[PDB]
Curated annotation (Swiss-Prot), chain A:
The lineage of its organism: Eukaryota, Metazoa, Chordata, Craniata, Vertebrata. Widely expressed. Highest levels in heart and skeletal muscle. The modification Phosphothreonine is found at residue 110. This is 26S proteasome non-ATPase regulatory subunit 14. Component of the 26S proteasome, a multiprotein complex involved in the ATP-dependent degradation of ubiquitinated proteins. This complex plays a key role in the maintenance of protein homeostasis by removing misfolded or damaged proteins, which could impair cellular functions, and by removing proteins whose functions are no longer required. Therefore, the proteasome participates in numerous cellular processes, including cell cycle progression, apoptosis, or DNA damage repair. The modification Phosphoserine is found at residue 68. Belongs to the peptidase M67A family. PSMD14 subfamily. It comes from the Eukaryota. Component of the 19S proteasome regulatory particle complex. The 26S proteasome consists of a 20S core particle (CP) and two 19S regulatory subunits (RP). The regulatory particle is made of a lid composed of 9 subunits including PSMD4, a base containing 6 ATPases and few additional components. Within the complex, PSMD4 interacts with subunit PSMD7 through their respective MPN domain. Interacts with TXNL1. The gene is PSMD14.
From Swiss-Prot, chain B:
Component of the 26S proteasome, a multiprotein complex involved in the ATP-dependent degradation of ubiquitinated proteins. This complex plays a key role in the maintenance of protein homeostasis by removing misfolded or damaged proteins, which could impair cellular functions, and by removing proteins whose functions are no longer required. Therefore, the proteasome participates in numerous cellular processes, including cell cycle progression, apoptosis, or DNA damage repair. Component of the 19S proteasome regulatory particle complex. The 26S proteasome consists of a 20S core particle (CP) and two 19S regulatory subunits (RP). The regulatory particle is made of a lid composed of 9 subunits including PSMD8, a base containing 6 ATPases and few additional components. Interacts with DDI2. Interacts with TASOR. It comes from Homo sapiens (Human). The chain holds residues 302 to 350 of 350 of the full protein. This is 26S proteasome non-ATPase regulatory subunit 8. The gene is PSMD8. Belongs to the proteasome subunit S14 family.
Length: 154, 49
């Protein structure tokens, strides 16, 4: 979205947009080249647009558009979930075997240059605990929902 | 031991009752404290950086 406003021909050999003592002009857009190839800047000028952001509307749009009450303590229970815990450990075993391979290698082939000639979008720490964090968060939210539901209901 | 303890002589037979309790169990009793323990797991994963 952008708003524009036409200029006259009286200052046509002079500098149009007669702007003065302020410093909020360099923001909100620089003149883009898909827009300045046409009538910018010797035909109109660009203007600044912000939003009248208000309360009594902002939270009632936020909380009412994205909301789910009983979803926070559902289970998606176990037959879909123990299978997921079954799967991730298996390649993480081979990821640990690939983690062994670089550690027992440990050669002075200028190891910062040995690592850049062995780039593979792979193990060292990136393909590491990222999976372990997902294995951590999935089982904690699964078990905390399991223990609270035994507590609350009778 | 008739007056200190029990041991009443019946028809030439003493009597001592059962001192065994009932053992009340639920075994889902730690449901609060196990829900406590998992909280300080993630509390010690996050929040202390």
């Amino acid at each position: 979205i952008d708003a524009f406003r036409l200029i006259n021909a009286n200052m046509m050999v002079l500098g149009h947009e007669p702007r003065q003592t302020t410093s909020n002009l360099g923001h909100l857009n620089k003149p883009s080249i898909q827009a300045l190839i046409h009538g910018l800047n010797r035909h109109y000028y660009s203007i600044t647009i912000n939003y009248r952001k208000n309360e009594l509307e902002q939270k009632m749009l936020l909380n009412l558009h994205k909301k789910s009450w009983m979803e926070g303590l559902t289970l998606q229970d176990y037959s879909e979930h123990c299978k997921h815990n079954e799967s991730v450990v298996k390649e993480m075993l081979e990821l640990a075997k690939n983690y062994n391979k670089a550690v027992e290698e440990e050669d002075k082939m200028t190891p910062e240059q040995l690592a850049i000639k062995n780039v593979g979008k792979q193990d060292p720490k990136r393909h590491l605990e990222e999976h372990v964090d997902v294995l951590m968060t999935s089982n904690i939210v699964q078990c905390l929902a399991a223990m609270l539901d035994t507590v609350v209901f009778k | 031991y008739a007056k200190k303890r029990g041991w009443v002589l019946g028809p030439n037979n003493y009597y001592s009752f059962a001192s065994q309790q009932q053992k009340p169990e639920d075994t889902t009793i730690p449901s609060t404290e196990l829900a406590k323990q998992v909280i300080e797991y993630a509390r010690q994963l996050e929040m202390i950086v």
